Amino acid sequence: THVLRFGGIFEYVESGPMGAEELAFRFAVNTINRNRTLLPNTTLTYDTQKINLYDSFEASKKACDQLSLGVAAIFGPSHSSSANAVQSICNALGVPHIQTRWKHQVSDNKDSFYVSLYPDFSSLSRAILDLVQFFKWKTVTVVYDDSTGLIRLQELIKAPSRYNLRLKIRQLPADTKDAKPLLKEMKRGKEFHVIFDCSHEMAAGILKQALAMGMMTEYYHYIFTTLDLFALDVEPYRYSGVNMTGFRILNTENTQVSSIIEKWSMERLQAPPKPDSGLLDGFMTTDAALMYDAVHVVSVAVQQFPQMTVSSLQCNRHKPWRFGTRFMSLIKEAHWEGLTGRITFNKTNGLRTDFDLDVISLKEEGLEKIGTWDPASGLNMTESLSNRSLIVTTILEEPYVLFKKSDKPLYGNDRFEGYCIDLLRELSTILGFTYEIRLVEDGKYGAQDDVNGQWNGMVREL
Amino acid sequence: GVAAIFGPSHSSSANAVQSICNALGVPHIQTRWKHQVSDNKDSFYVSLYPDFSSLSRAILDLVQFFKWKTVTVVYDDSTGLIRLQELIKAPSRYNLRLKIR
Numbered sequence: 001t002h003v004l005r006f007g008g009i010f011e012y013v014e015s016g017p018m019g020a021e022e023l024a025f026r027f028a029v030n031t032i033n034r035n036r037t038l039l040p041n042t043t044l045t046y047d048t049q050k051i052n053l054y055d056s057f058e059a060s061k062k063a064c065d066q067l068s069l070g071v072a073a074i075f076g077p078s079h080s081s082s083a084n085a086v087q088s089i090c091n092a093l094g095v096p097h098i099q100t101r102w103k104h105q106v107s108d109n110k111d112s113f114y115v116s117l118y119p120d121f122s123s124l125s126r127a128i129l130d131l132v133q134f135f136k137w138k139t140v141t142v143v144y145d146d147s148t149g150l151i152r153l154q155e156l157i158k159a160p161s162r163y164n165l166r167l168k169i170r171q172l173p174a175d176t177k178d179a180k181p182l183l184k185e186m187k188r189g190k191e192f193h194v195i196f197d198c199s200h201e202m203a204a205g206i207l208k209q210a211l212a213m214g215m216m217t218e219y220y221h222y223i224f225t226t227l228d229l230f231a232l233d234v235e236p237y238r239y240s241g242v243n244m245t246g247f248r249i250l251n252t253e254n255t256q257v258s259s260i261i262e263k264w265s266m267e268r269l270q271a272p273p274k275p276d277s278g279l280l281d282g283f284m285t286t287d288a289a290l291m292y293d294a295v296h297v298v299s300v301a302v303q304q305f306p307q308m309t310v311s312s313l314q315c316n317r318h319k320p321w322r323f324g325t326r327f328m329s330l331i332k333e334a335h336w337e338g339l340t341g342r343i344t345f346n347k348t349n350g351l352r353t354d355f356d357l358d359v360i361s362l363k364e365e366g367l368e369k370i371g372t373w374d375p376a377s378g379l380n381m382t383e384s385l386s387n388r389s390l391i392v393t394t395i396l397e398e399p400y401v402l403f404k405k406s407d408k409p410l411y412g413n414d415r416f417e418g419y420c421i422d423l424l425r426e427l428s429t430i431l432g433f434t435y436e437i438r439l440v441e442d443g444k445y446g447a448q449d450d451v452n453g454q455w456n457g458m459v460r461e462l
Numbered sequence: 463g464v465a466a467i468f469g470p471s472h473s474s475s476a477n478a479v480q481s482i483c484n485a486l487g488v489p490h491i492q493t494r495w496k497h498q499v500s501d502n503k504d505s506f507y508v509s510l511y512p513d514f515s516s517l518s519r520a521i522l523d524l525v526q527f528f529k530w531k532t533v534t535v536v537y538d539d540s541t542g543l544i545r546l547q548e549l550i551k552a553p554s555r556y557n558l559r560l561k562i563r
């Protein structure tokens with residue numbers, strides 16, 4: 001019957017047969033035609049090209065070769081430099097471009113034949129800012145890997161102008177995995193709250209060098225802007241008392257999504273993750289999820305456009321596609337729900353700015369969901385007793401309270417004696433008390449320090 | 463028969479022309495600053511615009527000479543943060559109070 005095929009330009013690799021994005025694309029294309037509910041009388045076909053993702057020339061060449069034959073839409077590369085050429089080609093030839101990864105769009109680029117499935121960092125940075133403000137942070141150390149990281153998290157970077165945050169922007173060393181010098185610089189600077197704008201594998205890298213260095217104590221809270229935090233192997237960090245936090249768009253809390261991800265993991269049995277990499281196994285990266293969702297949303301959109309006589313557009317001469325405008329508007333207005341939750345494209349942009357997030361933080365188990373984030377509503381973090389110990393504190397004033405003169409080691413309340421201890425015993429035998437003496441760590445009386453408006457010792461402990 | 467392409471003064475078009483020139487081997491002479499991704503291996507291109515990796519530190523030297531403790535970096539477009547990224551990272555190595563706008 002009627003048939004249309006989708007163009008696809010992905011990474012050219014040799015160790016693995018083909019990239020994870022291509023895996024997801026092929027999996028979903030052979031899922032659409034197999035699932036008779038979606039595209040019942042039309043079979044989806046995949047046209048796959050492999051490039052270096054950095055040679056925009058060969059990306060343009062492959063896009064032109066695909067457009068020479070019948071292509072309804074191009075699933076462009078997952079880079080920020082070869083995707084611009086492909087979207088320009090698609091716009092000039094009037095064919096939808098399908099971006100599953102974030103790239104910096106020029107403010108004066110009047111291009112409207114592309115859709116960006118990746119959640120816009122214009123909203124993800126606001127989500128990071130809301131997560132920081134919820135934790136009431138004051139010293140925040142934004143860490144990014146690529147120079148485009150500042151462009152990604154620019155709302156977070158501009159936040160100190162509005163809020164009271166103190167930002168110390170740092171960059172991971174380039175062309176090397178030596179994250180130890182940067183963590184050392186944090187240790188000298190006593191930077192405890194960190195925001196990591198690095199990929200999940202790189203995030204696992206810095207987590208490993210942080211554990212090997214001493215960053216995995218209780219006083220370190222890590223916010224990861226990456227959406228693949230659930231793919232990390234937090235087992236070495238599970239019981240370390242670390243407060244690492246992140247987000248997640250891959251809606252794993254669903255039966256259909258669980259079945260899809262389990263099928264994808266079962267299909268992924270040829271390139272297992274490296275055991276000594278700090279990463280999980282049998283999972284699905286967010287890039288594959290966005291590719292799956294992209295091809296699915298294009299399929300559900302083209303469900304409403306039965307006339308799909310793909311043309312033979314050339315690049316030597318420019319000729320807009322007769323079905324390109326309506327198909328592109330249909331893609332932009334298309335509303336589908338899948339692996340990454342609700343998929344709604346911004347009308348004025350084509351990017352996806354209205355997305356549903358789930359907040360992920362480290363707990364006693366591995367990365368439980370502790371809230372949700374929506375661009376409209378905002379951050380939604382949901383996460384006496386008679387037989388209760390009465391914690392008390394005291395200072396070592398010799399006439400008042402002093403350690404009992406017993407050579408035999410003694411613990412609990414009995415190890416403390418003095419006039420104040422006698423008064424506490426009298427109160428306990430007068431009232432109902434089950435009390436334990438907890439010595440003050442600061443070892444001082446309360447003092448209103450005008451330097452920062454902070455108390456200390458017993459008063460602050462109270 | 464052209465010996466060198468004096469490509470466009472815009473990031474996307476300059477990147478496209480630079481990739482084409484690198485593929486075909488002809489030099490691509492660009493006179494405007496554009497963000498070259500780190501892993502890019504294009505060789506047939508030279509940029510005459512003063513590298514903001516070396517000019518943002520000139521701005522930082524000016525700030526040091528004036529002994530500023532609080533600075534407000536104001537930029538226009540989103541690719542302005544990636545231009546003066548050394549100036550943004552400076553507060554780590556110095557004593558500044560950047561209030562980027």
Ligand SMILES: *[C@@H]1O[C@H](CO)[C@@H](O)[C@H](O)[C@H]1NC(C)=O
Pocket residue numbers: 372377380381382
């Ligand atoms: C937050 O999430 C809880 C649980 O899903 C829900 O009951 C509540 O209505 C949500 N609040 C907002 C403001 O979305």
